Amino acid sequence: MNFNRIPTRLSTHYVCDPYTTLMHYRRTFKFLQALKAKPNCRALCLGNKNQVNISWPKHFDGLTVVTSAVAAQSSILSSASVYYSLIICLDPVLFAKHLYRINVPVLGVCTPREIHEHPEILKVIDYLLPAPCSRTDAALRQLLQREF
Amino acid sequence: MQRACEMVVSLLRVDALSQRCPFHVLNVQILDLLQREGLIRGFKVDGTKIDILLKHYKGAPVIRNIRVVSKPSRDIWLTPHELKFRTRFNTGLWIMQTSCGVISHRDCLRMGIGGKMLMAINNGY
Amino acid sequence: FFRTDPGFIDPEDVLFAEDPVRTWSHADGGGDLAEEVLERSNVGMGTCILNNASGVLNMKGLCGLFRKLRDLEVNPLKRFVVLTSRHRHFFSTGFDLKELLFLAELTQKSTEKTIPLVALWQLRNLCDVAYLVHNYTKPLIVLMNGATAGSGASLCCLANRSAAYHSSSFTCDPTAYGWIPDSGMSFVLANLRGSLGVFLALTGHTLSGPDLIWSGLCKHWISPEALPFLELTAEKQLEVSEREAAVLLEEHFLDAPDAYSLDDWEEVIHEHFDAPTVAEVRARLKATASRQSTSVEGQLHAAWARAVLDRLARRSPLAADVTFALIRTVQQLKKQIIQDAGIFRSEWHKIRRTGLSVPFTLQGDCRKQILEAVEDRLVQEALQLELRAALRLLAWSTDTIDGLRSECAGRLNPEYAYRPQWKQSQRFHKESYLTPLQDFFPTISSSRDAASHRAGPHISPSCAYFFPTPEFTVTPRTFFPLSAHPLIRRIHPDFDEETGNDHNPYAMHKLQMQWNHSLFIQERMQALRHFRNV
Amino acid sequence: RTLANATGQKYDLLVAPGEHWMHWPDRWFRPISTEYARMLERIKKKRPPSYRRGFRA
Amino acid sequence: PPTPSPFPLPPSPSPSSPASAAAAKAAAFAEQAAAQTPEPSVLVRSAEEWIKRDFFFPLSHQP
Amino acid sequence: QTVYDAEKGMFVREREGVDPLIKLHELRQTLLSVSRMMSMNKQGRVYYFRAIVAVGNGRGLFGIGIAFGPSPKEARSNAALAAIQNLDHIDFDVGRTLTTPVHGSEYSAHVKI
RNA sequence: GGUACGAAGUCGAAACAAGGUAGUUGAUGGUGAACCAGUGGCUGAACAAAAA
RNA sequence: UCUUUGCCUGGAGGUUCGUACAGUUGUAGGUAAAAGGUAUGUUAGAGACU
RNA sequence: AGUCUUAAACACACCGCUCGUCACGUAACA
């Protein structure tokens, strides 16, 4: 049962429109094709702890450990623009204060529910990528990489 | 004249696409001049109210500052030789109301006729 | 119920329905949407919507269309101009028959058959717009969202980048109305694969769907939903170079499906529609109809010949001869202008693909020049001959009056439509309708010119002010904006140092007068009063 | 200037320079490359050269 | 010596509203005669006359 | 974790919570003020210094940082740290000529350029 | 009679925090000095405070 | 963003129809901080519990 | 006794803060 207020206005989502996804993939593919041609290219796959389906290593390069004293919005990935050249964030909502002034392209993959409620993530994300079914990124990218 | 000053509040919005405006004879003529300069994407008279679109570029809107000079309680008039001193070394847009219709400040000096400063667009101090 | 079921519909999908026509609610100055041409202020893009009560493209629409196209083309910021329409299930009708009825009775009223100034003023305007779209210096994207009736596809076929979709159609039946195709329509028909244009004009076969792009008319299949999106991401086009701009626009073009109705019938059209004479092909179709129907292939061919003949017997025999003579005349030119250079079949195929993709290599870039050179020459000849046959037909053919009224009255209701008898077929030289015409005063050589032909129809004296010659010429339009400050005039390419100006006041004075609706209304009104009173 | 001109789509030039940001010569249409193998084919198809407006050419 | 500049004809298919179109068309004719009508001495007419003319008609180019 | 500075030739901390990509030999700092605060505790009073240091390139960059420290010398260094991390781009004319004069406000203030 | 400033003595513990057993205010009464009793209004009001 | 009414300029102070009607902040001897408030600490015969 | 919550005109922080009558002296509106 539910005793709360029933909403009346239904907001529309144009960022994740079915037709808009056509150009999103086409434009994104061109950028990746040119980058892989060059030698010595490395990427970064940043996720979340809840993502059990995605295996993670023990150590992480570029990770900085800081203390509570004098930590006014310290940038964790400050030195992550030397060794890496492309970061694919999976939780832009959580990683929003650190990627505000990052000097690397961010391939964030958010969901329409978070985009509408948290539009601030649009400024930090450079190349927007859609996410069909928009439920859990852990099992979302696995299907795409294992098609047919 | 009162309805003319009510257009600045609606057109001066950041997080918006289209805003309504009361219908008026003088208001319709003003929108024509702004569209020529490329400040308004478009407008449509929806009967009792006029729907005017907003133009944006790289997030920020094209309009950043609006100054109302003329008011219903008084009337500002400047001679052809005095308007140049007021308006100098600037990129602003001043709406001039002359006898032969409504024109911008650039055209008022060309004809040399005494206009009337209504409002300012993209103006500093 | 299940999501995977065949008959499954999402309630949310039907809740977000929108009217595509309402998307163009906002326009340029003027709250009341009644202008024949509209424009929307965009960054790096030029919007142009053709809105009309019934898609009637009269002189009023052409005057506005020419100004907007030139204003946007000269602007360097606008790297490309897009065209579209606003009518529901309709497109540019292209000089509807209602306007032609007045030009026929007035011209044939006088004994001398002197063409008035109004008749020639409107006809010459149609050629200017047709040449501008083909010779556009920037890409011209256009989509046929509505159905085309009669000769009204000149604004999409002649465009630099033509597109189509499922909600499109192609209808062209000039023989039924007894009128020659205008707006340089013969150029596209003669450039089709094989003799497809001849069959599509004499019979007037209708085509819709993917067949348009597969036939050769269009070259893109962009969806209507792409145009609104272009207005939102147009600020990133000026950052890249000129060549890189065209690459981004290629992401909107989709693929074409496998579907064609004339896959096997194309060979029959070329075999039959091949005689240089109209009277010769008549026996060819009749012979096939009486052919002994045998096997499976013979059965289909026998019915095809019997059905096609019925349509040609309900048109004007004289009209069919004029259209066929002009379409084939320009077509034969391509076989000689390109063959004399020494080109092979294999080489020509590669050149055709240059228009469907942007060249990048030096070898590929050179091929594009050849296609542009031949195309520019063919259109000039087709338009020049098209005007010659248009003026003579209106002053000699008397059966054109009945056809114009029959179709005009039938639009409101079929009950008012009547089939006229046209006229009995007669032999003709099919050469007198393509003779050059000039208006030159020197006649010391025993009537060297003597107006159009030696004893043909003459033009009014008032037509010696704007157009010194009746022939359709090409004007050297500028490609950069003008200026008034002395410092800016020095940067314009066409800026002579002997006068300090970037334009000729005398030449530009007449150009503005020609493109003026207010001046034309007064001239048209004066002629109407004279005809009604006496 | 570069900001206002992009949206204003109007003359937004300075006093000293002349049309620096708006002037965009067609560098991919006029200076197009031409080879000697295909030049002979376009001579008989293009308009013959009969003009007098350029001395330093 | 003077140098009267030519004036372009107003466009008939103006996209502006009817109220502005009529005013613009009339204003074009005023400019033409403004540069081709030298004004007389100041002493000719009254002071009052001058003030009204300035706010009703453009300024001539041949004072 | 060091970077050479060939005309000086001495070890300097590279990262220390600072982007190594950004050259540190191209920026300048300007001390504004060194304010002093007071804190009360159970025994007596505790004083901690503070400073506001603005760091930004003199071409197209500007920034203001604020921090705290136990001593004036340490406060200055900490304040400068925030300025670097909060560097923002400006919209400046190529020709070195503004369009219109800007005006600025926060409570009583006015800074007319 | 009343008021200002400087110095400073005696007689009292009114305001702060529910101890003066809440405390400012409009109009009266009363008392060597904090001001006190009653009615109206306010919070610039403390403690305490529900299932079948 | 626009029309019109009303009101204030740090704090602060005054002799020891006619005893009626009307009307009132202002001409000083003196002073340089009255005061809104986010946070910390302390006090509390003010509430609760290892 | 050690914490938590709330209030405060004190923060050399309750040995805090602050008011009134009377006594003496110097003055401006008398």
Q: Residue B46: which residues within 8 A CB-CB, separation 6 or more?
A: B20
In whole angstroms, what is the distance from residue C262 CA to residue C211 CA? Answer: 9
Alpha helices, DSSP H, located in B1-125: 2-5, 7-11, 25-37, 80-86, 105-111
In whole angstroms, what is the distance from residue C40 CA to residue C187 CA? Answer: 32
Burial class (CB in 10 A: 0-12, 13-18, 19+), E25: middle
In whole angstroms, what is the distance from residue C127 CA to residue C323 CA? Answer: 18
A23·C225 Cβ contact <8 A:
no
Query: Which residues, listed in sequence order, are joined to residue F50 by a DSSP beta bridge?
Result: F68
Q: Which residue of B has its CA nearest to D11?
A: B37
Burial call A48-70: b when 16+ CB within 10 Å, e when fewer: beebeeeeeeeeeeeeeeeeeee
C453 by DSSP, 3-state: which? Answer: coil
Q: Which of C15, C221, C225 to mutate to test the interface with A (most CBs of A within 10 A)?
A: C225
Tell me the two tokens of residue C462: 């008032």
Q: What is the CA radius of gyration of chain B?
A: 15
Query: Which residues, listed in sequence order, are joined to residue A45 by a DSSP beta bridge?
Result: A88
Supply the DSSP symbol for C461: G
Query: Which residues, listed in sequence order, are joined to residue B121 by a DSSP beta bridge?
Result: B66, B93
Does residue C205 come out as left (phi exceeding 0), alpha (psi in the -120 to 50 range) or beta?
beta
Measured CA angle at A140 (ends A135, A142), to 5 deg: 155
Q: Residue B97 in contact with residue B115, Cβ under 8 Å?
A: yes
Backbone angles phi, psi at C498, to 5 degrees: -80, -15
Q: Which residue of E has its CA nearest to B112?
A: E59
Q: How many C-beta atoms lie closer than 10 Å to residue C74's C-beta?
A: 15
Nucleotides of H under 7 A from a protein CB: 1-4, 40-42
Does residue F105 come out as left (phi exceeding 0), alpha (psi in the -120 to 50 range) or beta?
beta
Q: Which residue of C has its CA nearest to A25?
A: C251
In whole angstroms, what is the distance from residue F46 CA to residue C279 CA? Answer: 114
Experimental method, per PDB record: cryo-EM
Q: Residue A139 in contact with residue A53, Cβ under 8 Å?
A: yes
Tell me the two tokens of residue C164: 């189509």
In whole angstroms, what is the distance from residue D38 CA to residue B6 CA? Answer: 66
Q: Residue C24 in contact with residue C49, Cβ under 8 Å?
A: yes
In whole angstroms, what is the distance from residue C59 CA to residue C63 CA? Answer: 6
Tell me the two tokens of residue B124: 């500093």
Q: Residue B41 in contact with residue C27, Cβ under 8 Å?
A: no
DSSP string covering C287-305, please?
HHHTS---TTHHHHHHHHH
In whole angstroms, what is the distance from residue F90 CA to residue C322 CA? Answer: 68
* Residue recorded with tokens 């002629």: C527
Measured between beta carbons, the chain D residues lying within 8 angstroms of C243 are 28
* Residue recorded with tokens 């203030």: F109
End-to-end C-alpha distance for chain D, whole angstroms: 35
Q: Residue C330 in contact with residue C190, Cβ under 8 Å?
A: yes
Q: Residue C158 in contact with residue C91, Cβ under 8 Å?
A: no
What is the sign of the dihedral through the CA atoms of C443, C448, C454 and C458?
Answer: negative
Helices C517-533 and C117-134 pack at an angle, to 10 degrees, of 150
In whole angstroms, what is the distance from residue C440 CA to residue C361 CA? Answer: 50
Measured between beta carbons, the chain E residues lying within 8 angstroms of C522 are none
Tell me the two tokens of residue C362: 């030096």
Least Cα separation, residue D17 to chain B (angstroms): 17
Q: Which residue of B has its CA nearest to E55?
A: B114
Query: Which residues, listed in sequence order, are joined to residue C41 by a DSSP beta bridge?
Result: C46
Whole-number Cα distances in Å, E8 to A16, C482, C509, E59: 51, 13, 8, 19
* Residue recorded with tokens 């500002």: B76
Q: Point out the residue among C15, C16, C251 whose CB comes nearest to the CB of A23.
A: C251
Measured between beta carbons, the chain C residues lying within 8 angstroms of D9 are 41, 43, 75, 77
What is the sign of the dihedral through the CA atoms of A89, A93, A96 and A98?
Answer: negative
Tell me the two tokens of residue C270: 């070329």
Nucleotides of I under 7 A from a protein CB: 11-13
Q: How many C-beta atoms lie closer than 10 Å to residue C444's C-beta?
A: 6
Pick the closest to residue A126 from A12, A19, A32 (CA basis).
Answer: A32
Pick the closest to residue C154 from C379, C358, C473 (CA basis).
Answer: C379
Q: Check CB contact of F66 with chain A, cutoff 8 Å.
A: no
C229·A10 Cβ contact <8 A:
no
Chain-centre distance for alpha carbon B27? 9
In whole angstroms, what is the distance from residue B21 CA to residue B9 CA? Answer: 10
At CB < 8 Å, which residues of chain E contact B? Answer: 16-17, 19-20, 23-24, 26-27, 30-31, 34, 54-59
Supply the DSSP symbol for B72: T
In whole angstroms, what is the distance from residue D9 CA to residue C77 CA? Answer: 7
Tell me the two tokens of residue C346: 């294999």
Q: Point out the residue among C15, C223, C251 whose CB comes nearest to the CB of A26.
A: C251
C67·E9 Cβ contact <8 A:
no
Measured between beta carbons, the chain C residues lying within 8 angstroms of D45 are 337, 341, 373-374, 377
What is the sign of the dihedral through the CA atoms of C353, C354, C360 and C362?
Answer: positive
End-to-end C-alpha distance for chain E, whole angstroms: 13
Q: Residue C168: which residues within 8 A CB-CB, separation 6 or more?
A: C143, C144, C145, C146, C147, C148, C208, C209, C212
Q: Residue C137 in contact with residue C80, Cβ under 8 Å?
A: no
Whole-number Cα distances in Å, A120 to A94, A97, A109, B59, C186: 12, 10, 14, 12, 56
Whole-number Cα distances in Å, C451 to C131, C438, C440, C444, C454: 26, 6, 7, 14, 7
In this structure, what is the dihedral angle of CA atoms A41, A47, A52, A58, given to the nearest 10 degrees?
60
Helix or strand (DSSP H, E) at F14 = none
Pairing assessment for the beta strands C207-208 and C169-170 based on DSSP bridges: antiparallel
Pairing assessment for the beta strands C81-85 and C49-50 based on DSSP bridges: parallel
A38 by DSSP, 3-state: which? Answer: coil
Q: Residue C424: which residues within 8 A CB-CB, separation 6 or more?
A: C317
In whole angstroms, what is the distance from residue B62 CA to residue B39 CA? Answer: 6
Q: Residue A142 in contact with residue A109, Cβ under 8 Å?
A: no
- Length A30 CA → H44 C1' (Å): 73
C26·B32 Cβ contact <8 A:
no
Measured between beta carbons, the chain F residues lying within 8 angstroms of A70 are 67, 78
In whole angstroms, what is the distance from residue A74 CA to residue C287 CA? Answer: 91
Does residue C4 come out as left (phi exceeding 0), alpha (psi in the -120 to 50 range) or beta?
alpha
In whole angstroms, what is the distance from residue C84 CA to residue C47 CA? Answer: 8
Tell me the two tokens of residue D29: 């249409």
Supply the DSSP symbol for F29: E
Query: Which residues, listed in sequence order, are joined to residue F48 by a DSSP beta bridge?
Result: F37
Alpha helices, DSSP H, located in C191-296: 196-202, 211-215, 226-230, 242-249, 266-272, 278-289
In whole angstroms, what is the distance from residue C377 CA to residue D45 CA? Answer: 8
B125·F101 Cβ contact <8 A:
yes
Pick the closest to residue B103 from E34, E19, E24 (CA basis).
Answer: E24
Q: How many C-beta atoms lie closer than 10 Å to residue A36's C-beta?
A: 11
In whole angstroms, what is the distance from residue A136 CA to residue A47 CA? Answer: 11
In whole angstroms, what is the distance from residue F9 CA to residue F3 CA? Answer: 10
Pick the closest to residue E20 from F73, B104, C280, C166 (CA basis).
Answer: B104
* Inter-chain Cβ pairs, chain C and chain D, closer than 8 A: 58
Q: Is the CB atom of residue F47 positioned under 7 angstroms from any atom of strand I?
A: no
Q: How many C-beta atoms lie closer than 10 Å to residue C2's C-beta?
A: 6
Alpha helices, DSSP H, located in C2-58: 11-15
In this structure, what is the dihedral angle of CA atoms C21, C26, C27, C33, given to the nearest 10 degrees?
70
Tell me the two tokens of residue A144: 């795409």
D31 by DSSP, 3-state: which? Answer: coil
Q: Check CB contact of F16 with chain A, cutoff 8 Å.
A: no
Q: Could you tell me the resolution of this structure in angstroms?
A: 3.3
Q: Residue B10: which residues within 8 A CB-CB, separation 6 or more?
A: B19, B20, B21, B52
Q: Residue B70 in contact with residue B84, Cβ under 8 Å?
A: no
Q: Residue C143 in contact with residue C91, Cβ under 8 Å?
A: no
Tell me the two tokens of residue A65: 């450990």
Q: Which of C67, C482, C485, C514 to mutate to test the interface with E (most CBs of E within 10 A)?
A: C67
Measured between beta carbons, the chain F residues lying within 8 angstroms of B124 are 99-103
Tell me the two tokens of residue F79: 């304040």
Pick the closest to residue F77 from F34, F38, F47, F46 (CA basis).
Answer: F34
Q: Residue F83 in contact with residue F51, Cβ under 8 Å?
A: no
Helices E18-34 and B25-37 pack at an angle, to 10 degrees, of 70
Helix or strand (DSSP H, E) at E50 = helix E47-54
Whole-number Cα distances in Å, A23 to A15, A130, C245, C248: 11, 11, 15, 10
* Residue recorded with tokens 């000699």: C396
Q: Point out the residue among E6, E9, E18 whose CB comes nearest to the CB of C513.
A: E9
In whole angstroms, what is the distance from residue A109 CA to residue A107 CA? Answer: 7
SS (H, E, C) C264-281: CCHHHHHHHCCCCCHHHH
Supply the DSSP symbol for C112: S
Task: Say which amino acid occupies C431.
Answer: E
In whole angstroms, what is the distance from residue C359 CA to residue C353 CA? Answer: 10
Whole-number Cα distances in Å, C461 to C8, C440, C505, E51: 72, 12, 25, 51
